[PDB]
Write a protein that binds this ligand. Structure first.
Ligand SMILES: *[C@@H]1O[C@H](CO[C@H]2O[C@@H](C)[C@@H](O)[C@@H](O)[C@@H]2O)[C@@H](O[C@@H]2O[C@H](CO)[C@@H](O[C@@H]3O[C@H](CO[C@H]4O[C@H](CO)[C@@H](O)[C@H](O)[C@@H]4O[C@@H]4O[C@H](CO)[C@@H](O[C@H]5O[C@H](CO)[C@H](O)[C@H](O)[C@H]5O)[C@H](O)[C@H]4NC(C)=O)[C@@H](O)[C@H](O[C@H]4O[C@H](CO)[C@@H](O)[C@H](O)[C@@H]4O[C@@H]4O[C@H](CO)[C@@H](O)[C@H](O)[C@H]4NC(C)=O)[C@@H]3O)[C@H](O)[C@H]2NC(C)=O)[C@H](O)[C@H]1NC(C)=O
Ligand SMILES: *[C@@H]1O[C@H](CO[C@H]2O[C@@H](C)[C@@H](O)[C@@H](O)[C@@H]2O)[C@@H](O[C@@H]2O[C@H](CO)[C@@H](O[C@@H]3O[C@H](CO[C@H]4O[C@H](CO)[C@@H](O)[C@H](O)[C@@H]4O[C@@H]4O[C@H](CO)[C@@H](O[C@H]5O[C@H](CO)[C@H](O)[C@H](O)[C@H]5O)[C@H](O)[C@H]4NC(C)=O)[C@@H](O)[C@H](O[C@H]4O[C@H](CO)[C@@H](O)[C@H](O)[C@@H]4O[C@@H]4O[C@H](CO)[C@@H](O)[C@H](O)[C@H]4NC(C)=O)[C@@H]3O)[C@H](O)[C@H]2NC(C)=O)[C@H](O)[C@H]1NC(C)=O
Ligand SMILES: *[C@@H]1O[C@H](CO[C@H]2O[C@@H](C)[C@@H](O)[C@@H](O)[C@@H]2O)[C@@H](O[C@@H]2O[C@H](CO)[C@@H](O[C@H]3O[C@H](CO[C@H]4O[C@H](CO)[C@@H](O)[C@H](O)[C@@H]4O[C@H]4O[C@H](CO)[C@@H](O[C@H]5O[C@H](CO)[C@H](O)[C@H](O)[C@H]5O)[C@H](O)[C@H]4NC(C)=O)[C@@H](O)[C@H](O[C@H]4O[C@H](CO)[C@@H](O)[C@H](O)[C@@H]4O[C@@H]4O[C@H](CO)[C@@H](O)[C@H](O)[C@H]4NC(C)=O)[C@@H]3O)[C@H](O)[C@H]2NC(C)=O)[C@H](O)[C@H]1NC(C)=O
Ligand SMILES: *[C@@H]1O[C@H](CO[C@H]2O[C@@H](C)[C@@H](O)[C@@H](O)[C@@H]2O)[C@@H](O[C@@H]2O[C@H](CO)[C@@H](O[C@H]3O[C@H](CO[C@H]4O[C@H](CO)[C@@H](O)[C@H](O)[C@@H]4O[C@H]4O[C@H](CO)[C@@H](O[C@H]5O[C@H](CO)[C@H](O)[C@H](O)[C@H]5O)[C@H](O)[C@H]4NC(C)=O)[C@@H](O)[C@H](O[C@H]4O[C@H](CO)[C@@H](O)[C@H](O)[C@@H]4O[C@@H]4O[C@H](CO)[C@@H](O)[C@H](O)[C@H]4NC(C)=O)[C@@H]3O)[C@H](O)[C@H]2NC(C)=O)[C@H](O)[C@H]1NC(C)=O
Lengths: 206, 206, 206, 206
């Protein structure tokens, strides 16, 4: 019987709108010793009931019981260590897996905007590109805006480790040629931990 | 013995960095019946221990006991009704004061930037002005940036009710003439509930 | 039982036609000790009967007795300290609340009128704005005139302290686009203590 | 006991000099039932001995037995389905995991090379970028050359699915400013299934 802690999705931490949650999961819960008793400790103080809220589930030939605890942004972004202390009878001595954003003197993500190669103009749909480099840690979200209104045709590579011990990632927003020539202004937003107001925006036009 | 609920400061709600808190206070707590027992209910479910955390305090010729409960942005911005149910013996039937951001189909704050009257150029320190109008509700924060770096010399009128049932407010950033002539770019940021990404920025230059 | 002194409205002080009055008010006057005896002292000499003139009034579960004393412009603008010395039997030692408007070197507000950001022109109703800065003390009132006739659509932020130890405040007069383009002449009037003839007017047009 | 099939590395498939191999691996092989009997079938006909060649290995508290089969370029690029049929006594009915790379009409990536945003020039190290889009299937590898000699400072995002059902990926080669200004010629090489000679190269310079 082994435990697994799950950090929250980025998007949900960086925004005041969402509810980011830390997830703890237990798999391989023997039919004979089905009792699992979760114990959550926030940094140090037990958050007891806090928000923990499981359910049981039959699976493989075993069980999978998942218990969830809500997290306060503030605390997370500030590194409060979150701890899961799960207990069973089959198990010998309760397992205690832990999890916190990975400490690490943050690096202010650099963000540039790059236009389509003359070459691409040859086709009926050009492609704009905004590289987001040298930031830390991975957590970060990118979104595109052509005005106040944000666009649809766009994807975002996940991050890769650079040599700096830094991070970088790209994002494409394919756009119908006309648009681009008709010199419209586009902007890719980058929300992250170190951006002064957890945000910065750049723009591409003609 | 009467109770008073206190909504959180704007700044602390709109940002993922801060810890916005709802404050409940009891004044006029008779020397003979000093026992006050707080009961907090979130929307409906009692948050029992949640985060409540008071202390007693001798004052006037009476007592003032303040108990505080932490609030999750999400929930607040979404209107969860927060309720304080205070009880004493002197008091007849516990008092139950409540409090939630004031419902009200929000209005996307319009934000413009205005330069100094030719007339002001006459002095050794000009003044830039960004009006923030027609938004709702009052909650909103304004900050100034000349580059990535944010400035110091600046104040922000509180809001006033307009005819629209809307709100508006101004903000000055006095700046040394040279600066202004040396065509530097300035920007006043407006963080609010309805701004797509809870933010928008405008700029003033030459 | 607690007393509250009320300085006169600005308009009423700065003009020779109005009668500006200082108001003293008593709240929570216990049904058993309803006797309240007003004692007015101007600067030093008791103004005894002067113009004091109350009446009694039953309220929530208490009484609220208001007594008023007329003030001479001259004396006020010159700083004569006005004092209210209220006495009751319930109360221990009569309360003596005082009131004079600000101490110090009044300063001449300098006023500028500013037009609507081109951007605002995009809408069906532009907005004119006249900042009134660097004045002392807060006392001051603003009024709008598009001709000899003054307008209606307009509000006035209260003052905020600046760094000069000075004061400033703004005022909006939203106006329907056409009229503004139709190059009409508008003026925001500023009545204050240090304006030569306790007034000054500026205008905005095309 | 569970089996895992491993497709060959791209470079090894697209080139006539390398030997690309499909790998089959068995984990959690119980100390009591350590007998694992590998059965390889190419597309349909069992390749019996073919080239299969394992060995046993003790691990955590279990065994991990890896057996490898060499693959003919031709057959692979043509889609021959490769199958691993592993059997043990502990296990109930042998596991048969399969593996062939993608089905469908491969598509010819179109490649563009893009320069660093003027803005980047502000720093001590610019960054070159060549987007590789609209290709199928994911299989593909990129390499950088500044001459005949290929560089080191560079990473390569994995692919992401686009809307065409196509694929695209980027690759950064940070380079010290001077060199870029010193107008040196750089080229990013793209080896893939549909590139005429399973290759194509583009260059960036001044
Ligand atoms: C009997 O059956 C059970 C389930 O049955 C499955 O069977 C298979 C065949 C399948 O086809 C289905 O039929 C069915 O799912 C078995 O349970 C499994 O038990 C495994 C252990 O034996 C366990 O392995 C771990 O898996 C980890 C990740 O697995 C992902 O993939 C699953 C399927 O795609 C998915 O369901 C999982 O949830 C998980 O994906 C991510 O899960 C998050 C939880 O919800 C989720 O988070 C969300 O959270 C917020 C909250 O609202 C919000 O929802 C967000 O959207 C979201 O972020 C993620 O989104 C979600 N992703 C997706 C795409 O949904 C894997 O990481 C583990 O790796 C570790 O184990 C190695 C092996 O021992 C170690 O060597 C490694 O070190 C590693 O752990 C390291 O930990 C270190 C510190 O913690 C790190 O430094 C290091 O980086 C880690 N290493 C790595 C490389 O990760 C591990 O393999 C399975 O997850 C579990 N399945 C499920 C679903 O529970 C059961 O075991 C069976 N019995 C047996 C024993 O055979
Ligand atoms: C014995 O002494 C006690 C204290 O002693 C005081 O004595 C005086 C003379 C003083 O000089 C000192 O010696 C000492 O302070 C007495 O206690 C007082 O009891 C009063 C009742 O008798 C009570 O009146 C209410 O006051 C409300 C606001 O008062 C502010 O001002 C205080 C002093 O400046 C300040 O300390 C208060 O805290 C409060 O200011 C704001 O307080 C928030 C609480 O901390 C604070 O919030 C923060 O929260 C976050 C959390 O971290 C973060 O900290 C943020 O930074 C921050 O936002 C605010 O910042 C803080 N502001 C500042 C500048 O710090 C007043 O609003 C009440 O008005 C209501 O009452 C009227 C009369 O009955 C009603 O008619 C009105 O309707 C009104 O209630 C309405 O409610 C509706 C719905 O709720 C609304 O629709 C409507 O808008 C409301 N109306 C209005 C106009 O408000 C009320 O007057 C005093 O506050 C209390 N003082 C203290 C400090 O507790 C005790 O009473 C004495 N015995 C007696 C009976 O004589
Ligand atoms: C009962 O009840 C009540 C409640 O109320 C309610 O009720 C109901 C039933 C009815 O009946 C009524 O009453 C109401 O509705 C009570 O009483 C109340 O309350 C209180 C007491 O407690 C008071 O006081 C408070 O508040 C205030 C405000 O007020 C104001 O406003 C209002 C509104 O509107 C009004 O009404 C009033 O009056 C005021 O004002 C006004 O008045 C004046 C005079 O008359 C005016 O003027 C006039 O005159 C002139 C001459 O020339 C001219 O003519 C003009 O035109 C006119 O008009 C003005 O203008 C007006 N305005 C308006 C608004 O309208 C406040 O202020 C206060 O406050 C205080 O406290 C706080 C806290 O503590 C603070 O903050 C502040 O500040 C103060 O104190 C102090 O002060 C100082 C100065 O600045 C400072 O510095 C310091 O610091 C402070 N301290 C502290 C602590 O802080 C208060 O609070 C009220 O008012 C009342 N109401 C009425 C009616 O009035 C009672 O009590 C009960 N009973 C029992 C329970 O006991
Ligand atoms: C014991 O323990 C262990 C743990 O671990 C650890 O430990 C230690 C002690 C040591 O010893 C070791 O082991 C380590 O460290 C265990 O085992 C383990 O774990 C597991 C089992 O459980 C496994 O598996 C998992 O993971 C995976 C990953 O893997 C990968 O990676 C890694 C890292 O590195 C490696 O190692 C491996 O191998 C892999 O890969 C690799 O390999 C291959 C082959 O060899 C390669 O290739 C090669 O070959 C070629 C030919 O030509 C060439 O030569 C090249 O060059 C070479 O290299 C490759 O490349 C490599 N790579 C790397 C990375 O390196 C994963 O994958 C898996 O996953 C799964 O599951 C999940 C969940 O479930 C999912 O998601 C996925 O997906 C999968 O499944 C499935 O799949 C499919 C496909 O896609 C899908 O669709 C589906 O959906 C799915 N399902 C689901 C549910 O979802 C897994 O998880 C591992 O691996 C191991 N490790 C090792 C060593 O390996 C055991 O178990 C224990 N015991 C007991 C307790 O029992």
């Amino acid at each position: 019987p082994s435990v697994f802690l799950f950090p929250p999705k980025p998007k949900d931490t960086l925004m005041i709108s969402r509810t980011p949650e830390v997830t703890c999961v237990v798999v391989d819960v023997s039919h004979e010793d089905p009792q699992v008793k979760f114990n959550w400790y926030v940094d140090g103080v037990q958050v007891h009931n806090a928000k923990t809220k499981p359910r049981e589930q039959q699976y493989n030939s075993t069980y999978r019981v998942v218990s969830v605890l809500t997290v306060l942004h503030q605390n997370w972004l500030d590194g409060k260590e979150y701890k899961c202390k799960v207990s069973n009878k089959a198990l010998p001595a309760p397992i205690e897996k832990t999890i916190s954003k990975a400490k690490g003197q943050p690096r202010e993500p650099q963000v540039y905007t790059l236009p389509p190669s003359r070459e691409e103009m040859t086709k009926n749909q050009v492609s704009l590109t905004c590289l987001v480099k040298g930031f830390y840690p991975s957590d970060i979200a990118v979104e595109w805006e052509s005005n106040g209104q944000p666009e649809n045709n766009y994807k975002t590579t996940p991050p890769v480790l650079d040599s700096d011990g830094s991070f970088f990632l790209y994002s494409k927003l394919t756009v119908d040629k006309s648009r681009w020539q008709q010199g419209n202004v586009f902007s890719c937003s980058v929300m992250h931990e170190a951006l002064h107001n957890h945000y910065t925006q750049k723009s591409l036009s003609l």
